[PDB]
PDB file of all heavy atoms in Angstrom:
ATOM      1  N   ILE D  89      14.198  21.615 115.589  1.00 41.38           N
ATOM      2  CA  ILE D  89      15.290  20.865 116.162  1.00 41.38           C
ATOM      3  C   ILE D  89      16.468  21.876 116.339  1.00 41.38           C
ATOM      4  O   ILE D  89      17.046  22.347 115.326  1.00 41.38           O
ATOM      5  CB  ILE D  89      15.688  19.776 115.216  1.00 41.38           C
ATOM      6  CG1 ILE D  89      14.530  18.752 115.049  1.00 41.38           C
ATOM      7  CG2 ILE D  89      16.880  19.004 115.777  1.00 41.38           C
ATOM      8  CD1 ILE D  89      14.758  17.809 113.958  1.00 41.38           C
ATOM      9  N   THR D  90      16.819  22.196 117.568  1.00 43.53           N
ATOM     10  CA  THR D  90      17.909  23.108 117.854  1.00 43.53           C
ATOM     11  C   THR D  90      18.832  22.410 118.875  1.00 43.53           C
ATOM     12  O   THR D  90      18.448  21.486 119.548  1.00 43.53           O
ATOM     13  CB  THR D  90      17.438  24.400 118.476  1.00 43.53           C
ATOM     14  OG1 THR D  90      16.830  24.072 119.772  1.00 43.53           O
ATOM     15  CG2 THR D  90      16.407  25.124 117.618  1.00 43.53           C
ATOM     16  N   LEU D  91      20.059  22.893 118.932  1.00 46.89           N
ATOM     17  CA  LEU D  91      21.060  22.347 119.846  1.00 46.89           C
ATOM     18  C   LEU D  91      20.591  22.372 121.222  1.00 46.89           C
ATOM     19  O   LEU D  91      20.647  21.301 121.911  1.00 46.89           O
ATOM     20  CB  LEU D  91      22.361  23.193 119.697  1.00 46.89           C
ATOM     21  CG  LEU D  91      23.438  22.800 120.722  1.00 46.89           C
ATOM     22  CD1 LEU D  91      23.866  21.406 120.618  1.00 46.89           C
ATOM     23  CD2 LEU D  91      24.577  23.862 120.510  1.00 46.89           C
ATOM     24  N   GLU D  94      17.935  19.745 121.758  1.00 49.92           N
ATOM     25  CA  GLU D  94      18.444  18.432 121.563  1.00 49.92           C
ATOM     26  C   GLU D  94      19.202  17.893 122.744  1.00 49.92           C
ATOM     27  O   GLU D  94      19.188  16.749 123.078  1.00 49.92           O
ATOM     28  CB  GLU D  94      19.305  18.397 120.279  1.00 49.92           C
ATOM     29  CG  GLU D  94      19.913  17.009 119.947  1.00 49.92           C
ATOM     30  CD  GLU D  94      18.913  15.975 119.448  1.00 49.92           C
ATOM     31  OE1 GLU D  94      18.201  15.422 120.297  1.00 49.92           O
ATOM     32  OE2 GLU D  94      18.801  15.777 118.191  1.00 49.92           O
ATOM     33  N   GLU D  95      19.828  18.868 123.530  1.00 51.46           N
ATOM     34  CA  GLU D  95      20.507  18.483 124.692  1.00 51.46           C
ATOM     35  C   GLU D  95      19.578  17.970 125.783  1.00 51.46           C
ATOM     36  O   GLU D  95      20.080  17.264 126.703  1.00 51.46           O
ATOM     37  CB  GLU D  95      21.312  19.699 125.244  1.00 51.46           C
ATOM     38  CG  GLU D  95      22.507  20.033 124.383  1.00 51.46           C
ATOM     39  CD  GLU D  95      23.208  21.344 124.766  1.00 51.46           C
ATOM     40  OE1 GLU D  95      22.638  22.212 125.436  1.00 51.46           O
ATOM     41  OE2 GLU D  95      24.417  21.473 124.425  1.00 51.46           O
ATOM     42  N   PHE D  99      14.732  13.967 119.650  1.00 48.66           N
ATOM     43  CA  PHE D  99      14.011  14.427 118.457  1.00 48.66           C
ATOM     44  C   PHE D  99      14.089  13.281 117.416  1.00 48.66           C
ATOM     45  O   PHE D  99      15.123  12.681 117.197  1.00 48.66           O
ATOM     46  CB  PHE D  99      14.685  15.633 117.825  1.00 48.66           C
ATOM     47  CG  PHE D  99      14.213  16.903 118.421  1.00 48.66           C
ATOM     48  CD1 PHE D  99      15.158  17.692 119.156  1.00 48.66           C
ATOM     49  CD2 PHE D  99      13.001  17.525 118.145  1.00 48.66           C
ATOM     50  CE1 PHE D  99      14.920  18.956 119.633  1.00 48.66           C
ATOM     51  CE2 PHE D  99      12.692  18.794 118.657  1.00 48.66           C
ATOM     52  CZ  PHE D  99      13.615  19.511 119.366  1.00 48.66           C
ATOM     53  N   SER D 100      12.948  13.103 116.684  1.00 48.56           N
ATOM     54  CA  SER D 100      13.003  12.361 115.475  1.00 48.56           C
ATOM     55  C   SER D 100      13.804  13.132 114.408  1.00 48.56           C
ATOM     56  O   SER D 100      14.130  14.370 114.526  1.00 48.56           O
ATOM     57  CB  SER D 100      11.601  12.159 114.870  1.00 48.56           C
ATOM     58  OG  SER D 100      11.110  13.364 114.445  1.00 48.56           O
ATOM     59  N   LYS D 101      14.256  12.397 113.373  1.00 47.76           N
ATOM     60  CA  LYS D 101      14.656  13.100 112.144  1.00 47.76           C
ATOM     61  C   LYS D 101      13.582  14.095 111.745  1.00 47.76           C
ATOM     62  O   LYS D 101      12.361  13.885 112.042  1.00 47.76           O
ATOM     63  CB  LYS D 101      15.006  12.153 111.114  1.00 47.76           C
ATOM     64  CG  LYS D 101      16.516  11.732 110.928  1.00 47.76           C
ATOM     65  CD  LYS D 101      16.954  11.038 112.190  1.00 47.76           C
ATOM     66  CE  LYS D 101      18.437  10.734 112.162  1.00 47.76           C
ATOM     67  NZ  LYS D 101      18.560   9.857 113.272  1.00 47.76           N
ATOM     68  N   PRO D 102      13.923  15.098 110.937  1.00 47.40           N
ATOM     69  CA  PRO D 102      12.911  16.154 110.664  1.00 47.40           C
ATOM     70  C   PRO D 102      11.763  15.618 109.807  1.00 47.40           C
ATOM     71  O   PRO D 102      11.986  14.885 108.851  1.00 47.40           O
ATOM     72  CB  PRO D 102      13.705  17.221 109.982  1.00 47.40           C
ATOM     73  CG  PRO D 102      14.977  16.690 109.585  1.00 47.40           C
ATOM     74  CD  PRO D 102      15.242  15.413 110.519  1.00 47.40           C
ATOM     75  N   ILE D 149      27.241  36.312 110.844  1.00 66.03           N
ATOM     76  CA  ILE D 149      27.295  36.458 109.432  1.00 66.03           C
ATOM     77  C   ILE D 149      27.071  37.985 109.104  1.00 66.03           C
ATOM     78  O   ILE D 149      26.161  38.560 109.518  1.00 66.03           O
ATOM     79  CB  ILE D 149      26.280  35.572 108.670  1.00 66.03           C
ATOM     80  CG1 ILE D 149      26.590  34.051 108.991  1.00 66.03           C
ATOM     81  CG2 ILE D 149      26.235  35.911 107.228  1.00 66.03           C
ATOM     82  CD1 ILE D 149      25.561  33.148 108.410  1.00 66.03           C
ATOM     83  N   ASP D 213      18.461  30.608 106.328  1.00 75.86           N
ATOM     84  CA  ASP D 213      19.063  29.510 107.066  1.00 75.86           C
ATOM     85  C   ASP D 213      18.237  28.266 106.687  1.00 75.86           C
ATOM     86  O   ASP D 213      17.406  28.295 105.844  1.00 75.86           O
ATOM     87  CB  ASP D 213      19.112  29.794 108.543  1.00 75.86           C
ATOM     88  CG  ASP D 213      17.770  29.716 109.311  1.00 75.86           C
ATOM     89  OD1 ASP D 213      16.658  29.651 108.639  1.00 75.86           O
ATOM     90  OD2 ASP D 213      17.788  29.745 110.558  1.00 75.86           O
ATOM     91  N   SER D 214      18.602  27.139 107.239  1.00 77.16           N
ATOM     92  CA  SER D 214      17.964  25.857 107.001  1.00 77.16           C
ATOM     93  C   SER D 214      17.901  25.094 108.324  1.00 77.16           C
ATOM     94  O   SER D 214      18.923  24.956 108.997  1.00 77.16           O
ATOM     95  CB  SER D 214      18.644  25.103 105.927  1.00 77.16           C
ATOM     96  OG  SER D 214      19.915  24.792 106.362  1.00 77.16           O
ATOM     97  N   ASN D 232      10.669   7.767 115.421  1.00 68.98           N
ATOM     98  CA  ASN D 232      11.608   8.107 114.342  1.00 68.98           C
ATOM     99  C   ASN D 232      11.499   7.299 113.129  1.00 68.98           C
ATOM    100  O   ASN D 232      11.555   7.798 112.016  1.00 68.98           O
ATOM    101  CB  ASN D 232      13.078   8.074 114.960  1.00 68.98           C
ATOM    102  CG  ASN D 232      14.057   8.445 113.993  1.00 68.98           C
ATOM    103  OD1 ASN D 232      14.011   9.660 113.437  1.00 68.98           O
ATOM    104  ND2 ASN D 232      14.982   7.587 113.610  1.00 68.98           N
ATOM    105  N   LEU D 233      11.357   5.979 113.282  1.00 66.98           N
ATOM    106  CA  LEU D 233      11.209   5.108 112.160  1.00 66.98           C
ATOM    107  C   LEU D 233       9.960   5.470 111.409  1.00 66.98           C
ATOM    108  O   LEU D 233       9.822   5.402 110.190  1.00 66.98           O
ATOM    109  CB  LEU D 233      11.218   3.637 112.538  1.00 66.98           C
ATOM    110  CG  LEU D 233      12.541   3.145 113.199  1.00 66.98           C
ATOM    111  CD1 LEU D 233      12.423   1.698 113.546  1.00 66.98           C
ATOM    112  CD2 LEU D 233      13.717   3.345 112.271  1.00 66.98           C
ATOM    113  N   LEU D 236      10.502   8.476 109.192  1.00 63.18           N
ATOM    114  CA  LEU D 236      11.243   8.147 107.996  1.00 63.18           C
ATOM    115  C   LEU D 236      10.281   7.394 107.035  1.00 63.18           C
ATOM    116  O   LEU D 236      10.471   7.518 105.845  1.00 63.18           O
ATOM    117  CB  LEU D 236      12.463   7.330 108.405  1.00 63.18           C
ATOM    118  CG  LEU D 236      13.562   8.014 109.209  1.00 63.18           C
ATOM    119  CD1 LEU D 236      14.747   7.192 109.462  1.00 63.18           C
ATOM    120  CD2 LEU D 236      14.071   9.281 108.523  1.00 63.18           C
ATOM    121  N   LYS D 237       9.512   6.415 107.553  1.00 61.65           N
ATOM    122  CA  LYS D 237       8.610   5.730 106.648  1.00 61.65           C
ATOM    123  C   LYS D 237       7.613   6.614 106.018  1.00 61.65           C
ATOM    124  O   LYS D 237       7.346   6.466 104.739  1.00 61.65           O
ATOM    125  CB  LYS D 237       7.937   4.561 107.424  1.00 61.65           C
ATOM    126  CG  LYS D 237       6.987   3.739 106.586  1.00 61.65           C
ATOM    127  CD  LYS D 237       6.375   2.575 107.333  1.00 61.65           C
ATOM    128  CE  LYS D 237       7.328   1.417 107.445  1.00 61.65           C
ATOM    129  NZ  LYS D 237       6.690   0.194 107.969  1.00 61.65           N
ATOM    130  N   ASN D 239       7.847   9.721 105.392  1.00 61.53           N
ATOM    131  CA  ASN D 239       8.493  10.516 104.356  1.00 61.53           C
ATOM    132  C   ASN D 239       8.732   9.652 103.080  1.00 61.53           C
ATOM    133  O   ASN D 239       8.290  10.121 101.935  1.00 61.53           O
ATOM    134  CB  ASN D 239       9.859  11.063 104.838  1.00 61.53           C
ATOM    135  CG  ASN D 239      10.414  12.062 103.845  1.00 61.53           C
ATOM    136  OD1 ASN D 239       9.670  12.787 103.251  1.00 61.53           O
ATOM    137  ND2 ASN D 239      11.741  11.997 103.637  1.00 61.53           N
ATOM    138  N   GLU D 240       9.277   8.489 103.240  1.00 60.69           N
ATOM    139  CA  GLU D 240       9.566   7.670 102.056  1.00 60.69           C
ATOM    140  C   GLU D 240       8.320   7.319 101.307  1.00 60.69           C
ATOM    141  O   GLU D 240       8.358   7.179 100.049  1.00 60.69           O
ATOM    142  CB  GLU D 240      10.408   6.466 102.484  1.00 60.69           C
ATOM    143  CG  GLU D 240      11.872   6.799 102.667  1.00 60.69           C
ATOM    144  CD  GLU D 240      12.700   5.724 103.279  1.00 60.69           C
ATOM    145  OE1 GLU D 240      12.572   4.547 103.001  1.00 60.69           O
ATOM    146  OE2 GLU D 240      13.582   6.188 104.070  1.00 60.69           O
ATOM    147  N   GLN D 241       7.186   7.082 101.962  1.00 62.68           N
ATOM    148  CA  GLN D 241       6.010   6.749 101.327  1.00 62.68           C
ATOM    149  C   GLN D 241       5.318   7.924 100.591  1.00 62.68           C
ATOM    150  O   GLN D 241       4.265   7.741  99.915  1.00 62.68           O
ATOM    151  CB  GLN D 241       5.037   6.177 102.303  1.00 62.68           C
ATOM    152  CG  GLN D 241       5.479   4.823 102.849  1.00 62.68           C
ATOM    153  CD  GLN D 241       4.484   4.248 103.873  1.00 62.68           C
ATOM    154  OE1 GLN D 241       4.462   3.040 104.084  1.00 62.68           O
ATOM    155  NE2 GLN D 241       3.715   5.069 104.581  1.00 62.68           N
ATOM    156  N   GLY D 242       5.739   9.107 100.773  1.00 64.14           N
ATOM    157  CA  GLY D 242       5.235  10.267 100.203  1.00 64.14           C
ATOM    158  C   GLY D 242       4.130  10.902 101.061  1.00 64.14           C
ATOM    159  O   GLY D 242       3.464  11.858 100.627  1.00 64.14           O
TER     160      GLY D 242
ATOM    161  N   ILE V  89      20.116   9.444 104.676  1.00 66.08           N
ATOM    162  CA  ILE V  89      19.308   8.860 105.806  1.00 66.08           C
ATOM    163  C   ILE V  89      18.178   8.151 105.220  1.00 66.08           C
ATOM    164  O   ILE V  89      17.329   8.844 104.580  1.00 66.08           O
ATOM    165  CB  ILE V  89      19.002   9.991 106.771  1.00 66.08           C
ATOM    166  CG1 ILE V  89      20.192  10.687 107.312  1.00 66.08           C
ATOM    167  CG2 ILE V  89      18.144   9.382 107.917  1.00 66.08           C
ATOM    168  CD1 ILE V  89      19.834  12.054 108.059  1.00 66.08           C
ATOM    169  N   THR V  90      17.989   6.899 105.454  1.00 63.36           N
ATOM    170  CA  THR V  90      16.855   6.143 105.022  1.00 63.36           C
ATOM    171  C   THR V  90      16.386   5.167 106.136  1.00 63.36           C
ATOM    172  O   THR V  90      17.157   4.859 107.015  1.00 63.36           O
ATOM    173  CB  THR V  90      17.179   5.222 103.781  1.00 63.36           C
ATOM    174  OG1 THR V  90      18.139   4.214 104.185  1.00 63.36           O
ATOM    175  CG2 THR V  90      17.861   6.033 102.638  1.00 63.36           C
ATOM    176  N   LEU V  91      15.113   4.824 106.016  1.00 62.57           N
ATOM    177  CA  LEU V  91      14.546   3.906 107.005  1.00 62.57           C
ATOM    178  C   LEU V  91      15.360   2.615 107.173  1.00 62.57           C
ATOM    179  O   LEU V  91      15.749   2.237 108.296  1.00 62.57           O
ATOM    180  CB  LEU V  91      13.141   3.582 106.654  1.00 62.57           C
ATOM    181  CG  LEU V  91      12.384   2.491 107.434  1.00 62.57           C
ATOM    182  CD1 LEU V  91      12.293   2.929 108.930  1.00 62.57           C
ATOM    183  CD2 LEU V  91      11.025   2.344 106.952  1.00 62.57           C
ATOM    184  N   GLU V  94      18.622   3.360 108.902  1.00 67.38           N
ATOM    185  CA  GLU V  94      18.373   3.765 110.259  1.00 67.38           C
ATOM    186  C   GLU V  94      18.166   2.612 111.253  1.00 67.38           C
ATOM    187  O   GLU V  94      18.511   2.632 112.379  1.00 67.38           O
ATOM    188  CB  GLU V  94      17.186   4.748 110.325  1.00 67.38           C
ATOM    189  CG  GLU V  94      16.869   5.225 111.751  1.00 67.38           C
ATOM    190  CD  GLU V  94      17.822   6.265 112.261  1.00 67.38           C
ATOM    191  OE1 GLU V  94      18.923   5.903 112.661  1.00 67.38           O
ATOM    192  OE2 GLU V  94      17.501   7.465 112.230  1.00 67.38           O
ATOM    193  N   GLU V  95      17.616   1.512 110.694  1.00 64.91           N
ATOM    194  CA  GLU V  95      17.406   0.299 111.541  1.00 64.91           C
ATOM    195  C   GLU V  95      18.749  -0.359 111.975  1.00 64.91           C
ATOM    196  O   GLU V  95      18.716  -1.033 113.047  1.00 64.91           O
ATOM    197  CB  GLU V  95      16.553  -0.699 110.831  1.00 64.91           C
ATOM    198  CG  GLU V  95      15.169  -0.165 110.542  1.00 64.91           C
ATOM    199  CD  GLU V  95      14.212  -1.104 109.872  1.00 64.91           C
ATOM    200  OE1 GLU V  95      14.668  -1.711 108.881  1.00 64.91           O
ATOM    201  OE2 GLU V  95      13.084  -1.274 110.357  1.00 64.91           O
ATOM    202  N   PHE V  99      22.313   7.755 112.967  1.00 62.18           N
ATOM    203  CA  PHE V  99      22.569   8.882 112.075  1.00 62.18           C
ATOM    204  C   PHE V  99      22.330  10.144 112.939  1.00 62.18           C
ATOM    205  O   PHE V  99      21.379  10.300 113.672  1.00 62.18           O
ATOM    206  CB  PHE V  99      21.480   8.954 110.962  1.00 62.18           C
ATOM    207  CG  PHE V  99      21.743   8.120 109.781  1.00 62.18           C
ATOM    208  CD1 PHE V  99      20.991   7.038 109.571  1.00 62.18           C
ATOM    209  CD2 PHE V  99      22.677   8.444 108.855  1.00 62.18           C
ATOM    210  CE1 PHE V  99      21.073   6.264 108.413  1.00 62.18           C
ATOM    211  CE2 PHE V  99      22.909   7.736 107.657  1.00 62.18           C
ATOM    212  CZ  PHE V  99      22.064   6.633 107.507  1.00 62.18           C
ATOM    213  N   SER V 100      23.261  11.100 112.688  1.00 58.87           N
ATOM    214  CA  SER V 100      22.931  12.529 113.099  1.00 58.87           C
ATOM    215  C   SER V 100      21.722  13.027 112.361  1.00 58.87           C
ATOM    216  O   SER V 100      21.273  12.474 111.344  1.00 58.87           O
ATOM    217  CB  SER V 100      24.145  13.430 112.784  1.00 58.87           C
ATOM    218  OG  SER V 100      24.311  13.688 111.421  1.00 58.87           O
ATOM    219  N   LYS V 101      21.208  14.169 112.856  1.00 59.31           N
ATOM    220  CA  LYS V 101      20.302  14.880 112.099  1.00 59.31           C
ATOM    221  C   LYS V 101      20.998  15.401 110.819  1.00 59.31           C
ATOM    222  O   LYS V 101      22.236  15.436 110.770  1.00 59.31           O
ATOM    223  CB  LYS V 101      19.733  16.137 112.895  1.00 59.31           C
ATOM    224  CG  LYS V 101      18.453  15.779 113.652  1.00 59.31           C
ATOM    225  CD  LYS V 101      18.639  14.821 114.678  1.00 59.31           C
ATOM    226  CE  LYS V 101      17.327  14.541 115.503  1.00 59.31           C
ATOM    227  NZ  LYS V 101      17.779  13.779 116.701  1.00 59.31           N
ATOM    228  N   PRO V 102      20.235  15.688 109.792  1.00 59.76           N
ATOM    229  CA  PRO V 102      20.842  15.942 108.471  1.00 59.76           C
ATOM    230  C   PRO V 102      21.724  17.126 108.465  1.00 59.76           C
ATOM    231  O   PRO V 102      21.370  18.153 109.133  1.00 59.76           O
ATOM    232  CB  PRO V 102      19.683  16.025 107.539  1.00 59.76           C
ATOM    233  CG  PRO V 102      18.537  16.249 108.367  1.00 59.76           C
ATOM    234  CD  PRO V 102      18.766  15.575 109.673  1.00 59.76           C
ATOM    235  N   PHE V 143      14.809   3.303  97.126  1.00 55.71           N
ATOM    236  CA  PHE V 143      13.581   4.075  97.028  1.00 55.71           C
ATOM    237  C   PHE V 143      12.605   3.553  95.991  1.00 55.71           C
ATOM    238  O   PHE V 143      11.404   3.300  96.255  1.00 55.71           O
ATOM    239  CB  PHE V 143      13.904   5.529  96.810  1.00 55.71           C
ATOM    240  CG  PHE V 143      12.648   6.422  96.546  1.00 55.71           C
ATOM    241  CD1 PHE V 143      11.962   6.912  97.606  1.00 55.71           C
ATOM    242  CD2 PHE V 143      12.200   6.610  95.211  1.00 55.71           C
ATOM    243  CE1 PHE V 143      10.853   7.678  97.389  1.00 55.71           C
ATOM    244  CE2 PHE V 143      11.125   7.391  95.014  1.00 55.71           C
ATOM    245  CZ  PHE V 143      10.416   7.976  96.128  1.00 55.71           C
ATOM    246  N   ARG V 146      11.109  -0.052  96.757  1.00 55.54           N
ATOM    247  CA  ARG V 146      10.136  -0.175  97.788  1.00 55.54           C
ATOM    248  C   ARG V 146       8.952   0.693  97.508  1.00 55.54           C
ATOM    249  O   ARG V 146       7.963   0.572  98.311  1.00 55.54           O
ATOM    250  CB  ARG V 146      10.831   0.271  99.105  1.00 55.54           C
ATOM    251  CG  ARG V 146      11.812  -0.760  99.612  1.00 55.54           C
ATOM    252  CD  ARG V 146      12.719  -0.120 100.723  1.00 55.54           C
ATOM    253  NE  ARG V 146      12.103   0.657 101.708  1.00 55.54           N
ATOM    254  CZ  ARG V 146      11.575   0.224 102.816  1.00 55.54           C
ATOM    255  NH1 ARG V 146      11.595  -1.088 103.170  1.00 55.54           N
ATOM    256  NH2 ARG V 146      11.019   1.096 103.682  1.00 55.54           N
ATOM    257  N   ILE V 149       4.190   4.455  95.350  1.00 53.67           N
ATOM    258  CA  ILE V 149       3.709   5.618  94.554  1.00 53.67           C
ATOM    259  C   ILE V 149       3.590   5.180  93.113  1.00 53.67           C
ATOM    260  O   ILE V 149       4.548   4.611  92.531  1.00 53.67           O
ATOM    261  CB  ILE V 149       4.710   6.788  94.758  1.00 53.67           C
ATOM    262  CG1 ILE V 149       4.678   7.225  96.204  1.00 53.67           C
ATOM    263  CG2 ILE V 149       4.260   7.974  93.871  1.00 53.67           C
ATOM    264  CD1 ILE V 149       5.805   8.220  96.611  1.00 53.67           C
ATOM    265  N   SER V 214      12.373  14.291  99.137  1.00 53.76           N
ATOM    266  CA  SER V 214      13.034  15.226  99.940  1.00 53.76           C
ATOM    267  C   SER V 214      13.653  14.477 101.167  1.00 53.76           C
ATOM    268  O   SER V 214      12.930  13.937 101.950  1.00 53.76           O
ATOM    269  CB  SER V 214      12.044  16.336 100.480  1.00 53.76           C
ATOM    270  OG  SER V 214      12.698  17.265 101.320  1.00 53.76           O
ATOM    271  N   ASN V 232      26.203  14.445 116.801  1.00 63.71           N
ATOM    272  CA  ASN V 232      24.932  15.047 116.432  1.00 63.71           C
ATOM    273  C   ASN V 232      24.875  16.437 117.003  1.00 63.71           C
ATOM    274  O   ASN V 232      24.403  17.404 116.294  1.00 63.71           O
ATOM    275  CB  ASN V 232      23.778  14.164 116.867  1.00 63.71           C
ATOM    276  CG  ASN V 232      22.416  14.790 116.608  1.00 63.71           C
ATOM    277  OD1 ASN V 232      22.149  15.064 115.433  1.00 63.71           O
ATOM    278  ND2 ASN V 232      21.646  15.099 117.609  1.00 63.71           N
ATOM    279  N   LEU V 233      25.209  16.671 118.209  1.00 63.91           N
ATOM    280  CA  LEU V 233      25.309  18.033 118.770  1.00 63.91           C
ATOM    281  C   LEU V 233      26.235  18.939 117.959  1.00 63.91           C
ATOM    282  O   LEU V 233      25.848  20.130 117.794  1.00 63.91           O
ATOM    283  CB  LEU V 233      25.625  18.002 120.242  1.00 63.91           C
ATOM    284  CG  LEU V 233      24.692  17.194 121.161  1.00 63.91           C
ATOM    285  CD1 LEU V 233      25.234  17.209 122.538  1.00 63.91           C
ATOM    286  CD2 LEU V 233      23.299  17.724 121.209  1.00 63.91           C
ATOM    287  N   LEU V 236      24.394  20.085 114.832  1.00 63.00           N
ATOM    288  CA  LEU V 236      23.364  21.135 115.122  1.00 63.00           C
ATOM    289  C   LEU V 236      24.085  22.463 115.405  1.00 63.00           C
ATOM    290  O   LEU V 236      23.677  23.530 114.994  1.00 63.00           O
ATOM    291  CB  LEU V 236      22.512  20.732 116.268  1.00 63.00           C
ATOM    292  CG  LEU V 236      21.604  19.500 115.987  1.00 63.00           C
ATOM    293  CD1 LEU V 236      20.834  19.208 117.239  1.00 63.00           C
ATOM    294  CD2 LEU V 236      20.702  19.773 114.816  1.00 63.00           C
ATOM    295  N   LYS V 237      25.177  22.479 116.182  1.00 66.85           N
ATOM    296  CA  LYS V 237      25.941  23.681 116.437  1.00 66.85           C
ATOM    297  C   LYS V 237      26.457  24.303 115.183  1.00 66.85           C
ATOM    298  O   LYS V 237      26.358  25.479 115.006  1.00 66.85           O
ATOM    299  CB  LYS V 237      27.030  23.354 117.444  1.00 66.85           C
ATOM    300  CG  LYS V 237      27.914  24.616 117.727  1.00 66.85           C
ATOM    301  CD  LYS V 237      28.979  24.442 118.858  1.00 66.85           C
ATOM    302  CE  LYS V 237      28.305  24.549 120.250  1.00 66.85           C
ATOM    303  NZ  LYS V 237      29.412  24.425 121.254  1.00 66.85           N
ATOM    304  N   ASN V 239      25.387  23.891 112.163  1.00 67.87           N
ATOM    305  CA  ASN V 239      24.225  24.434 111.454  1.00 67.87           C
ATOM    306  C   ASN V 239      23.907  25.785 111.973  1.00 67.87           C
ATOM    307  O   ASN V 239      23.800  26.778 111.179  1.00 67.87           O
ATOM    308  CB  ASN V 239      23.047  23.551 111.546  1.00 67.87           C
ATOM    309  CG  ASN V 239      21.969  24.088 110.660  1.00 67.87           C
ATOM    310  OD1 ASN V 239      22.102  24.319 109.538  1.00 67.87           O
ATOM    311  ND2 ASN V 239      20.741  24.279 111.262  1.00 67.87           N
ATOM    312  N   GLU V 240      23.737  25.952 113.263  1.00 69.20           N
ATOM    313  CA  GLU V 240      23.298  27.261 113.882  1.00 69.20           C
ATOM    314  C   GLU V 240      24.336  28.296 113.734  1.00 69.20           C
ATOM    315  O   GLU V 240      23.916  29.493 113.750  1.00 69.20           O
ATOM    316  CB  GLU V 240      22.906  26.945 115.393  1.00 69.20           C
ATOM    317  CG  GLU V 240      21.668  26.092 115.402  1.00 69.20           C
ATOM    318  CD  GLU V 240      21.285  25.603 116.831  1.00 69.20           C
ATOM    319  OE1 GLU V 240      21.791  26.175 117.810  1.00 69.20           O
ATOM    320  OE2 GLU V 240      20.400  24.688 116.839  1.00 69.20           O
ATOM    321  N   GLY V 242      26.074  28.661 111.007  1.00 68.18           N
ATOM    322  CA  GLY V 242      26.032  29.012 109.545  1.00 68.18           C
ATOM    323  C   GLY V 242      27.171  28.369 108.870  1.00 68.18           C
ATOM    324  O   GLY V 242      27.393  28.668 107.685  1.00 68.18           O
ATOM    325  N   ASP V 245      26.222  26.115 105.870  1.00 68.75           N
ATOM    326  CA  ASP V 245      25.896  26.966 104.719  1.00 68.75           C
ATOM    327  C   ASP V 245      27.124  27.520 104.013  1.00 68.75           C
ATOM    328  O   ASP V 245      27.250  27.570 102.839  1.00 68.75           O
ATOM    329  CB  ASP V 245      24.958  28.152 105.103  1.00 68.75           C
ATOM    330  CG  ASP V 245      23.530  27.683 105.519  1.00 68.75           C
ATOM    331  OD1 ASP V 245      23.090  26.662 104.930  1.00 68.75           O
ATOM    332  OD2 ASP V 245      22.962  28.335 106.363  1.00 68.75           O
TER     333      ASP V 245
END
Side-chain angles (χ1 to χ4, degrees):
Chain D
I89 301 167
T90 66
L91 171 62
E94 181 69 283
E95 289 173 340
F99 278 111
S100 70
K101 266 62 181 192
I149 296 174
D213 73 349
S214 63
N232 181 60
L233 298 179
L236 295 180
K237 179 175 281 189
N239 190 36
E240 279 169 40
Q241 294 179 154
Chain V
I89 301 167
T90 70
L91 173 59
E94 179 73 283
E95 293 182 316
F99 280 110
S100 73
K101 269 63 178 194
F143 173 84
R146 287 161 47 87
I149 298 169
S214 175
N232 178 59
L233 297 178
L236 295 178
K237 176 173 281 184
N239 185 50
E240 292 174 14
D245 290 329

